[PDB]
Amino acid sequence: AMHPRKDWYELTRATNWTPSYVTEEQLFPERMSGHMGIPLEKWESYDEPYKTSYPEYVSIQREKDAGAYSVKAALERAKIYENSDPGWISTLKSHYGAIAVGEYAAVTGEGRMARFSKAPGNRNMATFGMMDELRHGQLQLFFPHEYCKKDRQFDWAWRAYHSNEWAAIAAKHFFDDIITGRDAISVAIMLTFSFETGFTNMQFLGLAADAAEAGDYTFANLISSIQTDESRHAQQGGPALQLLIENGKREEAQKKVDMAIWRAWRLFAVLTGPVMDYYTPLEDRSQSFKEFMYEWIIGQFERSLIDLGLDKPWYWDLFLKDIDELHHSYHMGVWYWRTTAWWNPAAGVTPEERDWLEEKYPGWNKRWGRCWDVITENVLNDRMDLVSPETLPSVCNMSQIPLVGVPGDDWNIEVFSLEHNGRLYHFGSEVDRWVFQQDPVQYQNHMNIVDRFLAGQIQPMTLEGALKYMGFQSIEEMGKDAHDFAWADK
Amino acid sequence: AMHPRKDWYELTRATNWTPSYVTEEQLFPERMSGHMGIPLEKWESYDEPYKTSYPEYVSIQREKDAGAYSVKAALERAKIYENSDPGWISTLKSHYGAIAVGEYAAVTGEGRMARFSKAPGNRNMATFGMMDELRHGQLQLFFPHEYCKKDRQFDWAWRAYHSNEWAAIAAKHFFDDIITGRDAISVAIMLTFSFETGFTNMQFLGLAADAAEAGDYTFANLISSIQTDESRHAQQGGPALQLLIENGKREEAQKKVDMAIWRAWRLFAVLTGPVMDYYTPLEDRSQSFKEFMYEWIIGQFERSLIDLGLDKPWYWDLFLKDIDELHHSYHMGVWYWRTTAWWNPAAGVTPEERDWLEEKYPGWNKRWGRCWDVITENVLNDRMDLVSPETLPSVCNMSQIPLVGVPGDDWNIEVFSLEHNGRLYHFGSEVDRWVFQQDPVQYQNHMNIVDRFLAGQIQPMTLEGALKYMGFQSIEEMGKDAHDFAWADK
Amino acid sequence: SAFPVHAAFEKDFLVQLVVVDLNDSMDQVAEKVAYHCVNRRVAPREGVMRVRKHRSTELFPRDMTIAESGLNPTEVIDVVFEE
Amino acid sequence: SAFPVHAAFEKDFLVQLVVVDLNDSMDQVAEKVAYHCVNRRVAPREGVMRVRKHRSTELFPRDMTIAESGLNPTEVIDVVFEE
Amino acid sequence: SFESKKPMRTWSHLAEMRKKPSEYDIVSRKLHYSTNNPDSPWELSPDSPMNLWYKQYRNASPLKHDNWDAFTDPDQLVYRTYNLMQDGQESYVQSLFDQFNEREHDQMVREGWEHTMARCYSPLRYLFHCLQMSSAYVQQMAPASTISNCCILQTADSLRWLTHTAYRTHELSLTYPDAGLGEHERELWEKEPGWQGLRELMEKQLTAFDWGEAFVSLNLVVKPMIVESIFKPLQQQAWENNDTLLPLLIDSQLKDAERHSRWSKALVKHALENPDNHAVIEGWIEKWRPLADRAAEAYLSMLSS
Amino acid sequence: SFESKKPMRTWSHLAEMRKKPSEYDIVSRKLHYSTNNPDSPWELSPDSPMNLWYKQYRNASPLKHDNWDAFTDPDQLVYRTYNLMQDGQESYVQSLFDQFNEREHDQMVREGWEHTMARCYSPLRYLFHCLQMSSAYVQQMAPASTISNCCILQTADSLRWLTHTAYRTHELSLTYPDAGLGEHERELWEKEPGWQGLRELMEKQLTAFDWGEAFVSLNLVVKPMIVESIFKPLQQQAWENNDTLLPLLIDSQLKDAERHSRWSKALVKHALENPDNHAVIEGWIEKWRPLADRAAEAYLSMLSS
Amino acid sequence: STLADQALHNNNVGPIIRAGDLVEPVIETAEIDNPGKEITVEDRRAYVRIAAEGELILTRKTLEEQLGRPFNMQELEINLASFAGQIQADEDQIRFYFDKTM
Amino acid sequence: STLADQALHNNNVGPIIRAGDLVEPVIETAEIDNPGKEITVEDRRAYVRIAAEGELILTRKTLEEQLGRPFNMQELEINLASFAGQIQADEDQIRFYFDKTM
Ligand SMILES: Cc1ccc(O)cc1
Ligand SMILES: Cc1ccc(O)cc1
Ligand SMILES: [Fe+3]
Ligand SMILES: [Fe+3]
Ligand SMILES: [Fe+3]
Ligand SMILES: [Fe+3]
Structure with a gap:
């Protein structure tokens, strides 16, 4: 006979002890552990709500992968690459580049907890977390690898995080801030709670819905399987937060959640926003980006945050306005500066799409449409020189994404600036500036790409010089319009 | 350490012994064993060329099924049923009905060998064969089961072999003749060699090609996985044939091969022929039925038969002429009498298809086209009464399929008749009559469906009475034109 | 006096069960078979329909009845047009 | 005397790096920014382009140079049309 | 006339079940069409040889039930779940083989054990193959697909045991090359007294062609005799001769054996719904028990010598 | 200027390999972008706390190589094949647990063995968790993804051993409820002399923050000390006290341990391409050996008492 | 913020099941194991969002019966891509629930 | 019968590999392990027909290297949907071959 997990589980996490040969602080240094002075004994009340154990883990993960790889194998000849809308292919390129090696970086966030968390259950769940993120990194290199032979842009599934391409810098600045660059408890809060119960559902399930509509089941099946792991190891954050609140650290916990949610938001607005409302073919848009945000972030995530005892973030109303506005402008920026991307942005403003946009975002045509009107005119008159930029956008010193606003009839754009230690910084929002001020030592001597451009680090100091600095190794690799401007014909 | 299979394999099939308490003939009765008087000692030279062993078998078959079921699960929402051409759905209906419970019957052919073959290696390989066919029967009930809720015709995946529907009788007359109704050595020759290395490739790989073109990967993946088992247990027949030849039974072996190939041919001409050249959408026809026949039966199978030391069948030239002609007429018969089928036949004679047919079968329009011309005219003038039959076709006393010939400009039709034991039989070919005469006791008191109709066994003696006798339980279940005659619009 | 035969009509693609009558003229037999063939799968045409035993070179007379023909039940006949 | 500024043009969607000159009139500054905006994402229009510090209520004089304005390098300016 | 009916959630024959059909129900139930027509099991001449065989040895069996198809494997195994189960058990046994071989288990058995194994263990491949052959016969003759399916899996298990025995016979010969291991088993099966009760039993059982008998x-x-008088006594002898692998191997084989016993007893219970069947079953048990007891006595005498 | 290039058959960094890239190559190689910029490992302020930590404890390690990324796991394991391998080994161990529990193994151990297990075996969960924590630290600090991946799998193996120990501690307590099994392990780890060498060793090792050290x-x-002085001696003691399960369990754990040793030795061989590294490695071994030897001596004294 | 307020003020809990063989069985299980609760289902093809007010239970016994094959609760993780509510899971069932009422 | 005669008189042997992860590795293996033989490939999407004249060998060692992961010869059966030629298989390789020359 076998004995049920409930009867021996406590012994697997009965692993805290009282150090005698080194001090408690030497074994769990605050800068790596982030215990906020809460003594070891208090951490033993940590109770991970989504448990697993080693034999179950290897058995079940074996089955998860067998399915993922079998589906990929069975669908190799479905002509997704050849037959898919080029906007969908660019969605794959953007996803794998922006995510694959970041997943592998998440191993290190989990590792930070496995070694340095004072909560025994956290150290064990983070061990399975290490393994999960290894899976995710390896899956999302293996799957795009077959497309290398078809298109050099898929090389960026591996290369992007090794580059200084501007979106890759935005990704690394975020993930290095919330995953690899902070103490174990900050990782628990910012990564597993804020990012992994909050935003990743947008990219791994919201996007899966669109992928299924687009008939790409290899991808939809992959990312939804990945998220089943996420759903388990993300549950490390809640008990950490509850423990902090119980031990008088509510304010500190709230600040970390507030910061991580906003940082995640700005990154997903430039990655997922344009995918859902522009690159994904109209017929395959299960819901709009805003609709998905209201499902996943407002309806599900923010309600969970409340249930655990935290408050709505102070910037709530700013956040809501941003959901209506930000990604439309980020999309415009990525597309106009498409040559700086490793995917081919789809413009997504055929009349039929503009009608959809106007329905999903009343007032769109009087705003962003004013810009797309100019662009469309130039395309129809083959003034292609006016559809390609000859300077650099100004960039946020937090998000590393260009500084934008609302264009057109009720134009409004604001930069939030800050003098600090003899230097002038510019942020794309009140919240981004606030994030900086929460922890200046984390950020203060970081130079964004345009800062580097102005300080002589990019040579020559030209757009072409910048493109080379960003690591593009051939002309083929740089972004172009997804449909070679065939959309103008409509 | 583990020891390699080559070092212990002989002991797994060192299982022949000299009976002492019953006689050799009592233990292996000729009527069940079919040893043709060849003594036990001679059978020990039997050497199965495609080996497996129990641990490898359960491990590898576990992996085969995991893939088959994972793909099915991942593709449930691909809208194959809703979005596929109705001709493709009818192809699924025909396949599962004609095959699923016949696969399960094949367990018994394998079982007959497992108990009654004098060759120890054959008894072990037939044990894995029993298991394979169990897999195949269960897969091909499980997969169509989800469609029951959509269409009562999918009920026939289970019901067909329990019915007296005319195509089901043709299937059972064949499989009961070559699988369940003869001695172990006849099963080895007629089933594993003739049918399973010869014809099943047409339905499980040829058809898979068309399924992949049609974008039905759940089905293509299923039947190609099934055939990987076939490819192993079908290799029981070759060594049996070689053993018979070595022991002076060449003539007996050749006759059994000749009979089984022809019987298989007539059945696959009515099942697979219409699927490949008419039901399958034109754009999804990887090759014509004849092209697939020349690949699989002439190029591969007949060459293998020669290599093993057998001769081309005596009826070779008749066979070749039949490949040009028979299925075109079987298709016409199934479609005109579509109301007697459990699937919805597609006519497949839009001008675009008729051009393809003329290219694949020069002279088609001057032959079968003459008939389809009349039918098409009646459809276009809504004389639908002339597109539905009011009598029964005459049926072959061997194949159980209607008696046909070449229509049109160079009309030619021949029935091959036989008086025997005070009864008049009619066969659809010289070969079918020859098969009967090879073994009259197997066939002589069998009554085909029309024989039964004339002897008062079908009441009332009307087409409607016949339809009820065939087991149709509702109006929905009976065959209609796949496209509700929408093809006439072209 | 129902009399089953299996009949093949000229330019059709199959043999069908057609039930005629013991006292039917070959002219009447030909009509009953044609019913199931002409304007279904075979174009109508000018000429006289004739009845012969399957693949025979001899035609039955038009006025000859099936009873007078010596045909046995369930035997195969062709229905063809005079050359 | 290269002088980098970050500029936001009226009705555009972003802020861009535009490198002007220490001795440029606000009229010249406005032109250099417009180059990267008008007929790209912003429709041309009648009126005088003016330069102000970002979100300020005060406009720099047309003839005033950037050197005379007290602006610091990499500060943000708007380019707008007179009401 | 023909009436209109809507689609059913499952096969027509299961549609009146109260519960939702299981995987087992869907893929296992009522698949023998050969029981539909009493006068011609198979779609051939009613008097064809195989039709006569089935009419005599299945249809006319004294063991009778009006609904054999209602029989249910108490384990409700399908092909898919059998392989999951047995890949688990067989991977475990193969891992035992690997590890015990690493530890040189066979070198440490008690003096003379190789000779006991050569005489009493390695010729089991013949007995187990008889069980394999016999199980395949019950498969092909049983009057319900759910019965036949238990028999298919049992045929495979019999080959599993045969293969264990073949593997271990060869492996043991590598440490003890002078004991006739892998060389003299046919001779022993045919002529050694301790094997002759078993051989007579199986030769006669293999010519009992009525499906019920x-x-x-x-x-x-x-099969219950083999558990009582062969498997368990071998475990005891192994223990006494410092063979610690054989008892573990047999424990895995006994799991299969108990499964066979489980479905068998469930079939007896189904059959006994018909009162006439108690006497039929009991009569066959009394008929065969003496042969089985003699088989066990002769084997045990050989083992304990 | 920009030049034109064709698509490559694999990642740009593998495209000059002579052989076709393996699954291992594709998913494992050169994934630490944090080694690209010496002045700022992480995309933050170059002087951020974690950037200072990595510049000191990774970049400035005395153990140096110009191409750590070229390191190759000799077993070339990826996530997928690790789980195939370990589901095999762990399903085997779980089957051992099931079967030995059926046989009531624990009731038959020699008198007093439960007390030896309570003192010398069950507190191993603390030692194994230290190994788990320490392996995770090498993971997060190692300068190549192929190194870190061996460490991830080793962290998981450490938890595997911990979980074995937890399961068996609980199970043993069911037969022997009066030995402190599952109750007194923390006390023993903290205060029992035989555990104090090990505890001092691990507390100090866990504060060695240089990745190389x-x-x-x-x-x-x-880890080699644990194999020599804990695992193998426990197998010997088990044998002497009729515990036949523990030796089999430890044999499975030793397979993991040997794998760890294998990749470790491959890393040493890679490192030694740099002649300076022999002295660095040897110096750290000499530094830590005394603590390890004292740990083993104290444990062994406790076990043999 | 009307739209946002209403979206936030929900008490919906329950599993998000990815496309595959667990979708229909989980829906049916939610209905059976929470009698007198209305179960809502939003189908997004790649996943289905299944919810009830305040609490939603899935028992192993029911899920096994609806799935039609042997099933261990831990296996749900193969197909549980996300969930709303806090989670309490054991060998017999999984419970999705909220502490608060909004 | 010209067409039929020519189709029959072939000596093509080799594996038919079903759609999946073994197609390209088997093609590459056929080329490497049969140097100086021309390998023909017919792609039918659901399967690929791979052939050489008279004899075609696939070795485990080469197939493992081309597949890029650990591989046992017996595993080929997962994807070997059919084959032309007689078969001789062992732990080291599979050989497709004809006894006769036509
Ligand atoms: C980028 C990323 C990181 C971790 C993760 O789990 C998902 C995505
Ligand atoms: C009908 C049938 C029978 C056996 C088999 O293997 C395939 C098909
Ligand atoms: Fe992840
Ligand atoms: Fe994650
Ligand atoms: Fe089959
Ligand atoms: Fe078969």
Whole structure:
């Protein structure tokens, strides 16, 4: 006979002890552990709500992968690459580049907890977390690898995080801030709670819905399987937060959640926003980006945050306005500066799409449409020189994404600036500036790409010089319009 | 350490012994064993060329099924049923009905060998064969089961072999003749060699090609996985044939091969022929039925038969002429009498298809086209009464399929008749009559469906009475034109 | 006096069960078979329909009845047009 | 005397790096920014382009140079049309 | 006339079940069409040889039930779940083989054990193959697909045991090359007194062609004797001769054996719904018990010598 | 200027390999972008706390190589094949647990063995968790993804051993409820003399933050000592006290341990391409050996009492 | 913020099941194991969002019966891509629930 | 019968590999392990027909290297949907071959 997990589980996490040969602080240094002075004994009340154990883990993960790889194998000849809308292919390129090696970086966030968390259950769940993120990194290199032979842009599934391409810098600045660059408890809060119960559902399930509509089941099946792991190891954050609140650290916990949610938001607005409302073919848009945000972030995530005892973030109303506005402008920026991307942005403003946009975002045509009107005119008159930029956008010193606003009839754009230690910084929002001020030592001597451009680090100091600095190794690799401007014909 | 299979394999099939308490003939009765008087000692030279062993078998078959079921699960929402051409759905209906419970019957052919073959290696390989066919029967009930809720015709995946529907009788007359109704050595020759290395490739790989073109990967993946088992247990027949030849039974072996190939041919001409050249959408026809026949039966199978030391069948030239002609007429018969089928036949004679047919079968329009011309005219003038039959076709006393010939400009039709034991039989070919005469006791008191109709066994003696006798339980279940005659619009 | 035969009509693609009558003229037999063939799968045409035993070179007379023909039940006949 | 500024043009969607000159009139500054905006994402229009510090209520004089304005390098300016 | 009906959630024959059909129900139930027409099991001449065989040895069996198809494997195994189960058990046994071989288990058995194994263990491949052959016969003759399916899996298990024995016979010969291991088993099966009760039993059982008598003799008499008088005594002897692998191997085989006993007893219970069947079953058990007891006595005398 | 290039058959960094890239190559190689910029490992302020930590404890390690990324796991394991391998080994161990529990193994151990297990075996969960924590640290600090991946799998193996120990501690307590099994292990780890060498060793090893010293102390000193002085002696004691399960369990754990040793030695061989590294490695081994030897001596004294 | 307020003020809990063989069985299980609760289902093809007010239970016994094959609760993780509510899971069932009422 | 005669008189042997992860590795293996033989490939999407004249060998070692992961010869059966030629298989390789020359 076998004995049920409930009867021996406590012994697997009965692993805290009282150090005698080194001090408690030497074994769990605050800068790596982030215990906020809460003594070891208090951490033993940590109770991970989504448990697993080693034999179950290897058995079940074996089955998860067998399915993922079998589906990929069975669908190799479905002509997704050849037959898919080029906007969908660019969605794959953007996803794998922006995510694959970041997943592998998440191993290190989990590792930070496995070694340095004072909560025994956290150290064990983070061990399975290490393994999960290894899976995710390896899956999302293996799957795009077959497309290398078809298109050099898929090389960026591996290369992007090794580059200084501007979106890759935005990704690394975020993930290095919330995953690899902070103490174990900050990782628990910012990564597993804020990012992994909050935003990743947008990219791994919201996007899966669109992928299924687009008939790409290899991808939809992959990312939804990945998220089943996420759903388990993300549950490390809640008990950490509850423990902090119980031990008088509510304010500190709230600040970390507030910061991580906003940082995640700005990154997903430039990655997922344009995918859902522009690159994904109209017929395959299960819901709009805003609709998905209201499902996943407002309806599900923010309600969970409340249930655990935290408050709505102070910037709530700013956040809501941003959901209506930000990604439309980020999309415009990525597309106009498409040559700086490793995917081919789809413009997504055929009349039929503009009608959809106007329905999903009343007032769109009087705003962003004013810009797309100019662009469309130039395309129809083959003034292609006016559809390609000859300077650099100004960039946020937090998000590393260009500084934008609302264009057109009720134009409004604001930069939030800050003098600090003899230097002038510019942020794309009140919240981004606030994030900086929460922890200046984390950020203060970081130079964004345009800062580097102005300080002589990019040579020559030209757009072409910048493109080379960003690591593009051939002309083929740089972004172009997804449909070679065939959309103008409509 | 583990020891390699080559070092212990002989002991797994060192299982022949000299009976002492019953006689050799009592233990292996000729009527069940079919040893043709060849003594036990001679059978020990039997050497199965495609080996497996129990641990490898359960491990590898576990992996085969995991893939088959994972793909099915991942593709449930691909809208194959809703979005596929109705001709493709009818192809699924025909396949599962004609095959699923016949696969399960094949367990018994394998079982007959497992108990009654004098060759120890054959008894072990037939044990894995029993298991394979169990897999195949269960897969091909499980997969169509989800469609029951959509269409009562999918009920026939289970019901067909329990019915007296005319195509089901043709299937059972064949499989009961070559699988369940003869001695172990006849099963080895007629089933594993003739049918399973010869014809099943047409339905499980040829058809898979068309399924992949049609974008039905759940089905293509299923039947190609099934055939990987076939490819192993079908290799029981070759060594049996070689053993018979070595022991002076060449003539007996050749006759059994000749009979089984022809019987298989007539059945696959009515099942697979219409699927490949008419039901399958034109754009999804990887090759014509004849092209697939020349690949699989002439190029591969007949060459293998020669290599093993057998001769081309005596009826070779008749066979070749039949490949040009028979299925075109079987298709016409199934479609005109579509109301007697459990699937919805597609006519497949839009001008675009008729051009393809003329290219694949020069002279088609001057032959079968003459008939389809009349039918098409009646459809276009809504004389639908002339597109539905009011009598029964005459049926072959061997194949159980209607008696046909070449229509049109160079009309030619021949029935091959036989008086025997005070009864008049009619066969659809010289070969079918020859098969009967090879073994009259197997066939002589069998009554085909029309024989039964004339002897008062079908009441009332009307087409409607016949339809009820065939087991149709509702109006929905009976065959209609796949496209509700929408093809006439072209 | 129902009399089953299996009949093949000229330019059709199959043999069908057609039930005629013991006292039917070959002219009447030909009509009953044609019913199931002409304007279904075979174009109508000018000429006289004739009845012969399957693949025979001899035609039955038009006025000859099936009873007078010596045909046995369930035997195969062709229905063809005079050359 | 290269002088980098970050500029936001009226009705555009972003802020861009535009490198002007220490001795440029606000009229010249406005032109250099417009180059990267008008007929790209912003429709041309009648009126005088003016330069102000970002979100300020005060406009720099047309003839005033950037050197005379007290602006610091990499500060943000708007380019707008007179009401 | 023809009436209109809507689609059913499952096969027409299961549509009146109260519960939602299981995987087992869907893929296992009522698949023998050969029981539909009493006068011609198979779609051939009603008097064809195989039709006569089935009319005599299945249809006319004294063991009778008006709904054999209602029989249910108590384990409700399908092909898919059998392989999951047995890949688990067989991977475990193969891992035992690997590890015990690493530790040189066979070198440490008690003096002379190789000779006991050569005489009493390695010729089991013949007995187990008889069980394999016999199980395949019950498969092909049983009057319900759910019965036949238990028999298919049992045929495979018999080959599993045969293969264990073949593997271990060869492996043992590598440490003890002078004991006739892998060389003299046929001789022993044919001529050694301790094997002759078993051989007579199986030769006679394999010529019991009535499906009911085949099932009763195989699963209610022969196979329980093998558990009592062969498997368990070998475990005891192994223990006394410092063979620690054989008891673990046999424990895995006994799991299969108990499964066979479980479905067999469930079939007896189904059959006994018909009162007439108690006497039929009991009569066959009494008929075969003496042969089985003599088989066990002769084997045990050989083992304990 | 920009030049034109064709698509490559694999990642740009593997495209010059002579052989076709393996699954291992594709998913494992050169994934630490944090080694690209010496002045700022992480995309933050170059002087951020974690950037200072990595510049000191990874970049400035005395153990140096110009191409750590070229390191190759000799087993070339990826996530997928690790789980195939370990589901095999762990399903085997779980089957051992099931079967030995059926046989009531624990009731038959020699008198007093439960007390030896309570003192010398069950507190191993603390030692194994230290190995788990320490392996995770080498993971997060190692300068190549192929190194870190061996460490991830080793962290998981450490938890595997911990979980074995937890399961068996609980199970043993069911037969022997009066031995402190599952109740007194923390006390023993903290205060029992035989555990204090090990505890001092691990507390000190866990505060060796240089990645090179962490790897050497953990994998070249601590872990080989555990094999020599804990695992194998426990197998001997089990044998002497009729515990036949523990030796089989430890044999499975030793397979993991040997794998760890294998990749560790391959890393040493890679490192030694740089002649300066022999002295660095040897110096760390000499530094930690005394603590390891004292740990083993104290444990062994406790076990043999 | 009307739209946002209403979206936030929900008490919906329950599993998000990815496309595959667990979708229909989980829906049916939610209905059976929470009698007198209305179960809502939003189908997004790649996943289905299944919810009830305040609490939603899935028992192993029911899920096994609806799935039609042997099933261990831990296996749900193969197909549980996300969930709303806090989670309490054991060998017999999984419970999705909220502490608060909004 | 010209067409039929020519189709029959072939000596093509080799594996038919079903759609999946073994197609390209088997093609590459056929080329490497049969140097100086021309390998023909017919792609039918659901399967690929791979052939050489008279004899075609696939070795485990080469197939493992081309597949890029650990591989046992017996595993080929997962994807070997059919084959032309007689078969001789062992732990080291599979050989497709004809006894006769036509
Ligand atoms: C980028 C990323 C990181 C971790 C993760 O789990 C998902 C995505
Ligand atoms: C009908 C049938 C029978 C056996 C088999 O293997 C395939 C098909
Ligand atoms: Fe992840
Ligand atoms: Fe994650
Ligand atoms: Fe089959
Ligand atoms: Fe078969």
